[PDB]
Design a protein around this ligand. Structure first.
Ligand SMILES: CC(C)(COP(=O)(O)OP(=O)(O)OC[C@H]1O[C@@H](n2cnc3c(N)ncnc32)[C@H](O)[C@@H]1OP(=O)(O)O)[C@@H](O)C(=O)NCCC(=O)NCCS
Ligand SMILES: CC(C)(COP(=O)(O)OP(=O)(O)OC[C@H]1O[C@@H](n2cnc3c(N)ncnc32)[C@H](O)[C@@H]1OP(=O)(O)O)[C@@H](O)C(=O)NCCC(=O)NCCS
Ligand SMILES: CC(C)(COP(=O)(O)OP(=O)(O)OC[C@H]1O[C@@H](n2cnc3c(N)ncnc32)[C@H](O)[C@@H]1OP(=O)(O)O)[C@@H](O)C(=O)NCCC(=O)NCCS
Ligand SMILES: Nc1ncnc2c1ncn2[C@@H]1O[C@H](COP(=O)(O)OP(=O)(O)O)[C@@H](O)[C@H]1O
Ligand SMILES: Nc1ncnc2c1ncn2[C@@H]1O[C@H](COP(=O)(O)OP(=O)(O)O)[C@@H](O)[C@H]1O
Ligand SMILES: Nc1ncnc2c1ncn2[C@@H]1O[C@H](COP(=O)(O)OP(=O)(O)O)[C@@H](O)[C@H]1O
Ligand SMILES: Cc1ncc(C[n+]2csc(CCOP(=O)(O)OP(=O)(O)O)c2C)c(N)n1
Ligand SMILES: Cc1ncc(C[n+]2csc(CCOP(=O)(O)OP(=O)(O)O)c2C)c(N)n1
Ligand SMILES: Cc1ncc(C[n+]2csc(CCOP(=O)(O)OP(=O)(O)O)c2C)c(N)n1
Ligand SMILES: [Mg+2]
Ligand SMILES: [Mg+2]
Ligand SMILES: [Mg+2]
Lengths: 559, 559, 559
């Protein structure tokens, strides 16, 4: 005659869908779900703010391809978590945000309930679907919907609202076991038509100057050998987007990443694989594409992404593994890309890399490192230790790290993404550490870091093998902007503080690095320790430029 | 350097996407769009209310498989039209609502502009996507995005906001030539994996009492010979939903439609093809399905529709043509459905139809026909004249017509749909007439009809071959409900009026049919005439039941 | 031990708040509420579409100053009703939209429930507040909130969602009577500060060329003697907005309505009383105000309406009765407005009225009346019969009727309003007839009429003393627009049909008027009959201009 309850049926339902981890912050009305999650034997990571719990869930979805689960409380907690859900949806990362909510009777009459919000309706602009499980019997189906909505199609955020009265509901164990079920094939393959592939095959076979653009959807797809086999069999030069670095090793001879401007302006055919033609690509128009409409081949699971920005000549709609498998067989035996195109790009790549190596070896005063020589140490380390996640965010700290730090392994580089978010660092660190079981290095702008810095304590509390490298130049872009008025600090200034001391305040290992040699030693020691560390790398306050590579996007007064 | 403007570029862009028809109502700011559309040699149907121009667009989309286009004015006009957009999206009908909108400056500051509304944001819940084209250079891409969103994936409504200032913008004709383009493959094939098909084939193969449910998604797919070859090769009994009637001829030997309750309740495997397990299927639970969980196969283009209500043993995700084509090859040579199961349902169907024949053949007083003998006439007409669109809405008027009137051809029956909308009648009539160029018969409940009845004048003004049959029983369900108080008319009562006089008021032909013989002679004459007609079929006020077949869904006071 | 239920507690609660009338359309899940409303002895008006039920509720709120109550069904019915709620909110008319909705469990998981919609969340852009009563015990409080939100502050639409499961809930009679209560003072007076009034008093006392603008909020206020006493004591010339006609008799010697352009362009101080400076006033800027910022005094209950468009020099925030009472005492004994300002305007008024009388007496062919001589008959009739509601809508039909037809009594003229809505006519007629118990005349554009025409049957079914005058010129603005192509009708054309026949089809009295004399006789006979009548006034198809007075707002192609 045994009875179960809503707490347990939700635990069983999440387990049934292969969820063993949540990230969140406890409190009414969901503390005892968090407790019982752990009692059952599943891991819960408590954070210092729900936002960073949510950035954690978001990147766990990217890495694994099953939704990261974030757990928050009502109204204020939910709001913090849904800013992260918003982010997940924008980047196409599977993520379920679960939140407690209050009394339906009181919320609907807007009477002033404890943490009152229509969280279901507030979530809607920020996810693919916003649900609410009202009754115990619908938990399994409710969770199935959330998982399918997150993983299927273009993947993304789902919000599941959990009224406080869901949890204390009861049901027989025989009924619950009756209702509990595991979805068949929640992220199905979607195969494109033969003519879609043949139209693409035609454009590529006739290309004089082809290029392949790999985006983070391609990385997410987890079909690395087959994407690489496409590149190698076709002989086509390729470029990775920010988080597509390492999908093919960044030192692959066919990479044109070190000659991007030229390669994009001069190509005729451009093969977009899991890459939107959004602002990161200047919308497929302007001088970055030579002021012309290229012949775009585009592979994407989202049908209506095609023609979003420019006319796509060969739209291939489907999942990237399926599409790429067919395109390869379609291109089988075709001649390789033009040898004087591939040669021209390689000569540019060689030359630009020789030029960068010169900057990385240059000497600077103690405590006045620049971005080249500081990050040249991380470059060298990551070439030797590739099986490590690189978390990265900032302006100059992000741009220069993407240029300098070669990724040899896929799904390791985790950065600001589609929205250029400052705030993802410490959440990404916890999640990368949790889901990989391997070391994490973070290259943080100091401003960037301030958006999630308190989570240092969380990294310490779980004893995670994470090394936070702070690029401490004392401000946003630069740390030397003049006081606008007598004794008034500039808006872009930050305290050139002892972030190493802060790390040590919570049981972490703090370092200061005033030279490339000090940073090299500290990084090697930090990673090898297998312990929470922070390296306070001292960068020249005059080293950076305004907004890094995207300076031109700034609005300036001409009066 | 000759110039063109927004008016002409929009027209060209629409034409390039194979749109040649718009349904709407003119006025500030879009009257001169409609005129210029007509001047260019395309067709504009002006209605008496935008809702009906809208329902006209939605069903044009269903029948043609390219989106119907509704044009309306700002705030109030838009609102009227958006209610129809909502319905399209709910029914998976491709549709685009183009609405003029007011001044951004003024609307954004909520200052009280002419017909002030943020129509783009207000449209959000009622459509797949809600766009705005602010600039003349973005019209080709804006129209491409609208088209692709309406017809790709699960089809549905798209709203496109056309601010007043868009139209008077100018651009060189040469630059406009450069910007105009035709989307490649806007409604692409999506093919399922081998193992998804193999799982479904193995369910069907080992089924003891299988059944195929055909929904209006299977009808919409326009792969009638694939769907029929699957039914006939597998030997599986099938059942159509309201608008799937005629996809296979309703009198097909394998149809278990006339024995639905017993087939649904007793099947072990149920193959849903373009049919949601929503309220029309009692959500796959309850007495209707014998209080058990069936083994569902389900073919649908929308991945997250699976497990929406009940677990789906074999989910096959893709477009129905692609999926059915593959499933057919997988099952090739497999035994046909159990003979004692197909024959058992056939005996049930024969005896059931023989019972209905007796009801249709029976005799009633003059001016007091029932639903059987009145609609028995329309049944006979449509069997001999199947190439005619059948528009249908009401309670008893709908339910009984669905039962009685056999459809032998696909995409002819157009009814209330997923939301059970009273109001679709006269717009459906105008669009069916315009896109098919063939006759239409409408079986309208007298209440149903009053939601769109003023559009008789539209049907007359365009001289359309539409024969509206009003089932005039004098109210909602029944026309005899007693006066609740002395000299106070009940809320369900309607004037048992001369709808024939109303039709003739606008130049149409009117009939009153008091007997089956009078209805038959009027229908044969009306349909043969090729002119706008209305038959006022006088039905017994006491012939109906509460809410028809779904009378149990009513909430009653038990005190 | 007696039990009541949700149906009855809602009836008692509405009764308790002085509601004795609803307008709507029945069907699941609210038919038996409608039935029991009547059983109890309260009136229910069933319409042919929920939209017009809602336009009825909206104008019943304006007229009475207690919210009009509209009742609809779920999803599709709600949508139709909420287009009207939207309208109520925009015009500041108190109105409660009550709608049935479906199962919370199924709607929240978006599973496909009968008429599935989050109606509560869909309503939000279109009302002041959107509530949902989930439980029987909260009905009295739920209704109290709705009534207060509708009547208090700036009055407006409220949506109350009524889940199907609300109605079948039970409670003891002693509990229900315990919970049932009548709000104290739901539309409270709001008195402005002495300095607000003194700032206004200062501007008026120093005015060389003052004008008072009366809007429909002033009419709604129901303080006619005191508003008139302000005008008369100050000697200031005044202008009424569309529905403020008759607040003071339109033939008042101080009216500058017949010299509007001059009065507005030339004034220094402008006293806005319950009138927004929205598009109806060209936003307080441009040539209609002489290209200058006037010194505006503005009385409004909505604090943040001040400075919405132009800087307001003397903002007086409060309810108009309270404000006007204080301003009068503040102006007591002050000299009257400049005699050569008042004289100059009177000379213009006299002259322009003499000019209009000349057009009203001019002869036209049979069946080719113009707007002056046709409406000059209605003018003369309304001067003799002022205690009658004039419903009015159209382009030329509205503009010319506002100019020509003098209202001597307040809250009688009911027109298209802030949004210039075509669709309000027949609903306004039913409601005006219901709440006044007196005759109604409608002056309808023929296009205008088509948006609500089927409700003719509703007017007949309740035997209402309503006379519909159709201004039948055969189209939108004009009825003579050339066929754009061979045998293709223009988009602005309408059938010059026999709307008299349509009226008679439902038991009404139909007239055709081909001359002013025929229209005069028909109108006198129609009103005096006390019965549902329609007069099909035949207007010259070439008589009207594009969009009437607001022609310049049209967007035209210059290429
Ligand atoms: C928008 C964006 C995609 C544009 O790309 P980009 O910066 O112009 O190009 P890349 O970052 O790939 O490369 C930078 C330059 O270094 C060069 N380079 C790249 N890799 C190199 C390598 N390994 N060795 C030598 N040179 C290299 C490239 O050639 C390029 O210069 P080029 O344009 O003259 O060819 C990119 O700047 C970006 O992802 N921005 C994110 C900014 C953000 O969101 N942060 C927060 C906002 S303040
Ligand atoms: C909900 C719904 C799908 C349920 O299906 P249903 O009505 O029970 O089943 P059908 O309409 O297919 O068939 C009706 C009955 O007539 C019988 N029948 C069907 N076709 C027949 C035929 N041509 N000859 C003889 N009998 C027939 C069936 O056996 C069935 O009864 P059963 O339960 O004993 O088997 C259906 O009622 C529906 O589409 N409702 C829409 C109503 C609506 O929109 N309401 C408007 C607002 S009030
Ligand atoms: C926008 C609006 C407020 C502007 O006001 P307007 O039309 O310029 O001014 P009025 O309607 O009060 O008066 C019209 C003219 O007739 C004159 N007039 C008014 N009453 C008169 C009378 N009784 N005798 C003689 N002349 C009169 C006025 O002097 C004015 O002309 P003027 O500007 O040269 O002085 C007005 O046109 C309006 O309410 N429009 C509504 C349109 C709508 O919503 N319909 C649907 C849109 S198509
Ligand atoms: N499995 C998959 N197969 C194909 N496309 C995918 C898959 N997962 C995600 N996508 C698509 O990949 C794209 C990711 O692009 P974007 O986030 O812009 O990448 P980047 O910023 O790296 O260019 C999205 O358009 C998304 O629809
Ligand atoms: N071309 C297509 N291929 C596959 N599925 C489709 C296609 N077009 C529409 N659909 C699906 O068909 C379904 C229609 O179901 P529904 O509207 O409930 O039909 P019914 O009411 O007849 O059961 C939707 O779930 C939709 O996603
Ligand atoms: N009792 C009241 N006292 C004061 N102001 C009111 C009252 N009721 C409504 N109002 C205000 O009256 C105004 C009505 O203006 P509007 O609808 O633009 O009128 P018009 O169109 O006639 O100019 C609104 O701004 C509203 O806030
Ligand atoms: C939440 C959020 N706030 C603000 C910004 C704008 N922004 C871009 S980069 C940046 C910080 C740049 O400074 P830093 O992280 O120290 O990198 P640096 O250039 O100094 O190396 C900010 C605030 C943002 N992208 N996200
Ligand atoms: C817009 C809208 N309003 C109300 C309803 C509720 N409703 C369902 S059926 C129906 C009409 C039933 O009467 P009728 O059309 O005459 O069919 P009958 O049963 O009398 O044959 C109504 C109003 C609805 N479905 N849609
Ligand atoms: C719901 C809605 N649709 C469209 C319009 C645009 N509109 C303004 S007036 C008008 C009709 C004008 O014709 P009519 O009513 O016959 O008046 P007339 O000028 O011919 O006398 C229309 C459709 C509107 N205001 N509201
Ligand atoms: Mg910095
Ligand atoms: Mg009826
Ligand atoms: Mg007209």
């Amino acid at each position: 005659v045994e009875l179960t309850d809503g707490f347990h049926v939700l635990i069983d339902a999440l387990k049934m869908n292969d969820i063993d981890t949540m990230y969140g912050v406890v409190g009414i009305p969901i503390t005892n779900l968090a407790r019982m999650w752990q009692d059952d034997g599943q891991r819960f990571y408590s954070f210092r703010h729900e936002q960073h719990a949510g950035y954690a869930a978001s990147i766990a979805g990217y890495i694994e391809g099953k939704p990261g689960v974030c757990l928050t409380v009502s109204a204020p907690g939910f709001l913090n978590g849904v800013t992260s859900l918003a982010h997940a949806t924008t980047n196409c990362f599977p993520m379920i945000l679960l939140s407690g909510s209050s009394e339906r009777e009181i919320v609907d009459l807007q009477q002033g309930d404890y943490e009152e919000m229509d969280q279901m309706n507030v979530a809607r602009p920020h996810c693919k679907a916003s649900f609410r499980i009202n009754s115990i019997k619908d938990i399994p189906i409710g969770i199935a919907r959330a998982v399918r909505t997150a993983v299927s199609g273009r993947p993304g955020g789902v919000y599941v609202d959990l009224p406080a009265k869901l949890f204390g509901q009861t049901i027989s164990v025989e009924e619950a076991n009756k209702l509990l079920f595991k979805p068949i094939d929640p992220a199905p393959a979607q195969i494109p038509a033969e003519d879609a592939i043949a139209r693409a095959a035609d454009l590529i076979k006739n290309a004089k100057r082809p290029v392949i653009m790999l985006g983070k959807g391609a990385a997410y797809a987890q079909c690395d050998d087959e994407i690489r086999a496409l590149v190698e069999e076709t002989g086509i030069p390729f470029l990775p987007m920010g988080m597509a670095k390492g999908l093919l090793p960044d030192n692959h001879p066919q990479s044109a990443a070190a000659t991007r401007a030229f390669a994009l302006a001069q190509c005729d055919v451009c093969v977009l694989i899991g890459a939107r033609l959004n602002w990161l690509m200047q919308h497929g128009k302007g001088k970055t594409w030579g002021d012309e409409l290229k012949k775009y081949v585009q592979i994407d699971i989202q049908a209506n992404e095609m023609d979003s920005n420019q006319p796509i000549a060969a739209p291939v709609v489907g999942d990237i593994k399926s599409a790429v498998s067919l395109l390869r067989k379609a291109l089988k035996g075709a001649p390789k890309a033009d040898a004087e195109w591939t040669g021209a790009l390689k000569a540019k790549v060689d030359g630009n890399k020789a030029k960068l190596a010169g900057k990385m070896t240059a000497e600077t005063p103690s405590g006045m490192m620049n971005y080249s020589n500081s990050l040249g140490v991380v470059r060298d380390f990551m070439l030797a230790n590739p099986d490590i996640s690189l978390v990265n965010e900032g302006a100059n700290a992000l741009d220069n790290t993407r240029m300098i730090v070669d990724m040899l392994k896929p799904r390791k580089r985790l950065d600001s993404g589609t929205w250029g978010v400052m705030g993802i660092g410490m959440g990404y660190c916890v999640a990368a550490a949790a889901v990989t079981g391997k070391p994490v290095i973070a290259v943080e702008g100091d401003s960037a870091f301030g958006f999630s810095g308190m989570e240092l304590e969380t990294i310490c509390r779980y004893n995670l093998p994470v090394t936070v490298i702070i690029m401490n130049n004392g401000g946003i872009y630069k740390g030397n902007e003049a006081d606008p008025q007598p004794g008034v600090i500039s808006c872009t200034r930050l305290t050139r503080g002892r972030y190493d001391m802060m790390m040590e305040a919570f049981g972490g290992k703090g370092y200061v690095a005033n030279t490339p040699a000090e940073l090299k030693a500290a990084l090697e020691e930090a990673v090898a320790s297998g312990k929470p560390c922070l390296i306070n790398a001292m960068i020249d306050p005059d080293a950076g430029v305004e907004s890094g590579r995207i300076k031109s996007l700034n609005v300036v007064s001409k009066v």
